[PDB]
Design a protein around this ligand. Structure first.
Ligand SMILES: [Zn+2]
Lengths: 96, 129, 125, 81, 97, 220, 219, 87, 25
RNA sequence: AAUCCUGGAUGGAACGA
RNA sequence: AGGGGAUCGAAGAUGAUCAGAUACCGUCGUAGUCUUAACCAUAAACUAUGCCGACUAGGGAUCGGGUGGUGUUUUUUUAAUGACCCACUCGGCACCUUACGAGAAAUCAAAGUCUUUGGGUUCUGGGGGGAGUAUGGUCGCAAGGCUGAAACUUAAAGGAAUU
């Protein structure tokens, strides 16, 4: 009989089932528990300002071969240290 | 432990119609089954049917004709306002121009067209087409 | 190994199919006949075909062979092919005029049929 | 098959069925009027009796129980009524 | 967000049957599986019977036979016994020869 | 042409003029030239061409599987799937197979009765593989609400307005299109109340004019 | 409505019962055959010869409805039926297929055993299963000389018989030919029993072929 | 299958299997249209006049074409025999 | 590695860790 | 005319890319 | 924890093989294997198919019970019973054939009667790893069981079949 209860007065079982089973999609668990505001150096923000500590050459993953020219950046509102990529050939010279 | 005698009946009818048989025996019987079959009979989806009187609950022998594709059952028998017959008919009928949803009203068991005409609503039972 | 191939066997089969009232059992005259009769492009093929025709003729003379038919075997078949004996096995005069049915068969006859000669036996396990 | 009269089956096809699986169920059992050689009174005896039924006049054995039909005793007069 | 791994299909088992031991390897195998044969053999080979009948008192003498039921595990049967290995279709067959 | 398969003889004689008789008597087609005669307005369309590889000792036999849909927008479609070592030959033979597998389509009305039907008559479903394709009737102007492949199939069917609802792995066109084809074939396998009137069972032309166009010899 | 001329005569019943057509199956009667009559004890069931005859007359009516007789195909893979189907096709205008069937004969154009019949006749559906299958592929009816054990799938009209014996099969074929000739024939029905012996059918074994070769040698 | 102005539409009104009153569609290649002859006196089957019976692949597959044909022929009146309604 | 032996590995590790924590507690 | 009959097995070492 | 303790035999000791071989093979053999009184409570604990109920295809055989048969045999030729045979039936362990259906397929008389989506009801899963880990509780003499995350990482992992 399809497992779930079909009875006209089973709405409690149905909704409590949903409540317990929504904790298996990543988006719901993220939203509810709060991982942006706890983890995630951008505290649920789109952007963040930071101060450049260092320039870095990250060697790419296989099967490619290159050095990607990132920077170690300290964020202002958290103090978290973070690697960030500088695109667009050059521009590691335009940062300092 | 049967729970819906109507469900058992209509599963039997649907299965025999699939199998190509021209008759089915269904037990037990009930007023609801008789009225549902009377509706199907009125709209031509089945032939005559005969109620055997054992002293227990009843048997029915239905003579069917092949015009039926599916007879079905909506369990639980939800409560239906007149605004919602449209939604039910669209969901569980093949087309707008034929097929009948069966529902139980204070005026009686009947099809949704008759329910529109009598301007009443009620509880949904099944569908025929 | 000395297995003959399908070109040889098929050509021999055809030559037997349509030149059976010729084709002595001797390889030599069969060979000269193959020359007379078929546009074979090589002596070696001609001789192989002649040898296989001779083999088939031999095992024809000592009995029929499957696959082949040369119109003489066929007209001999349809000569036989119809045996209408002096009296059938379905007359009862070969028997004693009656038909030795059982009880249920007699009941069947009583149900559907009409007057019919018979006599009953009650065979069992 | 694919067409048949389920209301008017044959008695042959209906007698071999289970008692409950017939069109209308009912017992395959019956009652007997029984007299022993001694007396000439009739005793009503059920075919599936479950008891060692006695003849009230001559306190003797008439039927002994079994798994189904009762086994009537040595040669006696028994009807089906 | 629980996560897991493989898992597997099935043969009609019983319940529990007691095991026997393979006559070559001593492996415990259940009796249902337990490839079983009956070695019925004359005590003497088919050629020594002449010599022994010539040398024996008691004419017709008896020629008895030795009988023993052999249980093989699957591995040992495949390495020795006439069990050998079959195609998908032929391995539905169930007759002896 | 020199036809065989008695229908071909009747058609080259010109006595059968419509495919409706063929469909009515469920006659099995075996020559594409039959319907190429009976239906000149048919046009083709190549949905997809994909390679399929057989591994070998040496390398990979790479063949090409073509899916071709044929139709006129008047209630006839066909679908052919063919694999061959060359794309052009795959397409050619797929067009043949698609012509050879041609089914009619019961295109009806959504709500009411004006001229020249536009939609399907019933909610229909087809399945091949995991894919289930459901065709639902739609009102005028809705168009064909479907992915491009099923849309093109329904255009060549002449279905003006229809909704679709699909399930399964729809990123495999062979099975998707086959499910759709099965649905629009099932359109006729559905007793509606208008198709309750009994009819007197017409006679097959294959039985009417047999000696007219049976297989005779012409020795000389 | 068939007149009373096309009824079961006692001479035909004598022939059928002498051929033992009425002897059914020791093993099993499949449920789709209610042609039984109060099974014989310690063995086989008994067939209703009247039902057999009436089904036979139906099949004859169908065969006569076929306009072109060459569009009627007579299959027999059993040795007991090859003589029957050959002489049947001889008397009628039918076309026989005795021995192997070469799959792809009802389907399959360019191959040269290709036939497009309007009807197919079969002695044993179990041994001629390929033909029933092809006919179901390509829209062809079937007439089958069934026993009570034989499968009833994709067979239209089934003539209950005994397919164990020579005489039963050959006699069923004889009566089929007799009736499809009585219909659309120069024969008027009753007073003419069609002077063609049933033993023109009834497969002769090679030992009797040899015996009668010896007869031809004697005189 | 008809529009407002009469003017029938829906090409190919299909055949119905008589044993089940079920539609026989174009791709149903196991379907059969039996063609039985009408006789008169003298025998003489009347070439051209027929009694037709359509059957479907479903019935032929499940194995009930013979019984269905017995019934249909009997109630059309060319057997006073085989088919009994009470099995 | 075989899951049986990975389970045994984690178990021996788990009881080592229990003991090392009892040292403090 | 003499005349008793047989089917049946195993057997070490061989890591890597 | 008592008793028992023949056999086999975690550990261990030894002979050999081996590049090594504290592994396979061989000989010893402690705990254990048995039992009593208590604990533990897991298992590929597997018909990885939850229970209940109805319907839907054929076939034969088998276990238990019942019915019927001028049935066979044993008896006391011939009676009852007992065992067998035939037919039927209820309820079980299952099996053979087929697909009207179902399914990704392997296969399935259920894994069918499900986009022609609803008979009743419980449990569980939501890409792979990390991880059934850490932590906290709870049970346990312990071994451990039950409950049970996150960070971080990753585009595949996986299932049936094909050459
Ligand atoms: Zn072993």
């Amino acid at each position: 009989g399809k497992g779930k209860p079909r009875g006209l007065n089973s709405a409690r079982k149905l909704r409590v089932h949903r409540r317990n089973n929504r904790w298996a999609e990543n988006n719901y668990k993220k939203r509810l528990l709060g991982t942006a505001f706890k983890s995630s150096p951008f505290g649920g923000s789109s952007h963040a300002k930071g101060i450049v500590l260092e320039k870095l050459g990250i060697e790419s993953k296989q099967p490619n071969s290159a050095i990607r020219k990132c920077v170690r950046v300290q964020l202002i509102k958290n103090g978290k240290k973070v690697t960030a990529f500088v695109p667009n050939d050059g521009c590691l010279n335009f940062v300092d | 432990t049967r729970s819906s005698v109507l469900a058992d009946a209509l599963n039997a009818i649907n299965n025999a119609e699939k199998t190509g048989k021209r008759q089915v025996l269904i037990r037990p019987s009930s007023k609801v089954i008789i009225k549902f079959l009377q509706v199907m009979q009125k709209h031509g989806y089945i032939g005559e049917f005969e109620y055997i009187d054992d002293h227990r609950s009843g048997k029915i022998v239905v003579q069917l004709n092949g015009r039926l594709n599916k007879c079905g059952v909506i369990s639980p028998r939800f409560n239906v306002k007149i605004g919602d017959i449209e939604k039910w008919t669209a969901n569980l009928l093949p087309a707008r121009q034929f097929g009948y949803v069966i529902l139980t009203t204070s005026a009686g068991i009947m099809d949704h067209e008759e329910a529109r005409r009598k301007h009443v609503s009620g509880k949904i039972l099944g569908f025929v087409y | 190994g000395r297995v003959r191939t399908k070109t040889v066997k098929r050509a021999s089969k055809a030559l037997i199919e349509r030149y059976y009232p010729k084709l002595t059992l001797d390889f030599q005259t069969n060979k000269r006949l193959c020359d007379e009769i078929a546009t074979i492009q090589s002596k070696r093929l001609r001789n192989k075909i002649a040898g296989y025709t001779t083999h088939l003729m031999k095992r024809i003379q000592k009995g029929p062979v499957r696959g082949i038919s040369f119109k003489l075997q066929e007209e001999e078949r349809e000569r036989k092919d119809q045996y209408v004996p002096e009296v059938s096995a379905l007359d009862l005069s070969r028997s004693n005029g009656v038909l030795n049915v059982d009880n249920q068969t007699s009941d069947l006859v009583k149900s559907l049929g009409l007057k019919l000669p018979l006599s009953v036996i009650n065979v069992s396990a | 098959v694919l067409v048949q009269d389920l209301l008017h089956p044959t008695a042959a096809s209906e007698a071999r069925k289970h008692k409950l699986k017939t069109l209308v169920q009912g017992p395959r059992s019956y009652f007997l009027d029984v007299k022993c050689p001694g007396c000439l009174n009739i005793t009503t005896v059920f075919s599936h009796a479950q008891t060692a039924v006695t003849c009230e006049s001559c306190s003797t054995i008439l039927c002994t129980p079994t798994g189904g039909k009762a086994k009537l005793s040595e040669g006696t007069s028994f009807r089906r009524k | 967000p629980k996560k897991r791994a493989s898992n597997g299909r099935n043969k009609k088992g019983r319940g529990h049957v007691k095991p026997v031991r393979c006559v070559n390897c001593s492996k415990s195998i259940p009796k249902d599986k337990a490839i079983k044969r009956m070695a019925i053999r004359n005590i003497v080979e088919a050629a020594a019977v002449r010599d022994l009948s010539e040398a024996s008192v008691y004419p017709e003498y008896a020629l008895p036979k030795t009988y023993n039921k052999l249980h093989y595990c699957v591995s040992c049967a495949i390495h020795a016994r006439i069990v050998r290995v079959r195609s998908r279709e032929d391995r539905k067959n169930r007759a002896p020869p | 042409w020199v036809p065989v398969t008695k229908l071909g003889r009747l058609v080259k004689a010109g006595k059968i003029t419509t495919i409706e008789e063929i469909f009515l008597h469920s006659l099995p087609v075996k020559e594409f030239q039959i319907i190429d005669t009976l239906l000149p307005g048919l046009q083709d369309e190549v949905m997809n061409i994909k390679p399929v590889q057989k591994q070998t000792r040496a390398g990979q036999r790479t063949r090409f599987k073509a899916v071709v849909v044929v139709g006129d927008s008047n209630g006839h479609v066909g679908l052919g799937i063919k694999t061959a070592k060359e794309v052009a030959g795959a397409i050619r033979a797929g067009i043949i197979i698609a012509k050879l597998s041609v089914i009619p389509i019961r295109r009806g009305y959504w709500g009411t009765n004006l001229g020249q039907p536009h939609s399907l008559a019933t909610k229909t479903t087809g399945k091949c593989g995991s894919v289930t394709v459901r065709l639902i009737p739609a009102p005028r102007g809705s168009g064909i609400v479907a992915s491009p492949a099923v849309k093109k199939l329904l255009q060549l069917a002449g279905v003006e307005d229809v909704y679709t609802q699909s399930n399964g792995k729809t990123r495999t066109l062979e099975n998707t299109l086959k499910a759709a084809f099965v649905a629009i074939g099932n359109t006729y396998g559905f007793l509606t109340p208008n198709l309750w009137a009994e009819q007197p069972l017409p006679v097959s032309p294959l039985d009417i004019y047999s000696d007219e166009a049976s297989a005779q010899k012409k020795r000389f | 409505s068939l007149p009373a001329t096309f009824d079961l005569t006692p001479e035909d019943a004598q022939l059928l019962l002498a051929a033992n057509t009425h002897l059914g199956a020791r093993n099993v009667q499949v449920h789709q055959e209610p042609y039984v009559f109060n099974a014989r004890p310690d063995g086989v069931h008994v067939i209703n010869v009247g039902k057999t005859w009436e089904k036979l007359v139906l099949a004859a009516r169908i065969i006569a409805a076929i306009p072109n007789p060459e569009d009627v195909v007579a299959i027999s893979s059993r040795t007991f039926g090859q003589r029957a189907v050959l002489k049947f096709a001889a008397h009628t205008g039918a076309t026989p297929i005795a021995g192997r069937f070469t799959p792809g004969s009802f389907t399959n154009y360019i191959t040269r055993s290709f036939k497009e019949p309007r009807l197919v006749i079969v002695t044993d559906p179990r041994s001629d299963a390929q033909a029933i299958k092809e006919a179901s592929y390509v829209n062809i009816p079937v007439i089958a000389l069934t026993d009570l054990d034989s499968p009833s799938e994709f067979v239209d009209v089934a003539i209950p018989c005994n397919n164990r014996g020579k005489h039963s099969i050959g006699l069923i074929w004889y009566l089929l030919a007799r009736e499809v000739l009585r219909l659309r024939g120069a024969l008027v029905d009753r007073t003419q029993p069609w002077s063609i012996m049933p033993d023109l059918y009834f497969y002769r074994d090679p030992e009797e072929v040899e015996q009668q070769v010896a007869e031809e040698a004697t005189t | 299958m008809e529009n407002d102005k009469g003017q029938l539409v829906e090409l190919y009104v299909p055949r119905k299997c008589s044993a089940t009153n079920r539609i026989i569609k174009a791709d149903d290649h196991a379907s059969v249209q039996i063609n039985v002859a009408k006789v008169d006196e003298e025998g003489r089957a009347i070439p051209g006049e027929y009694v037709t019976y359509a059957l479907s692949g479903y019935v032929r597959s499940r194995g009930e074409s013979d019984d269905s044909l017995n019934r249909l022929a009997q109630n059309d009146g060319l057997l006073k025999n085989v088919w009994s309604y009470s099995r | 590695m075989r899951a049986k032996w990975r389970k045994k590995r984690t178990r021996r590790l788990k009881r080592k860790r229990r003991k090392v924590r009892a040292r403090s507690k």
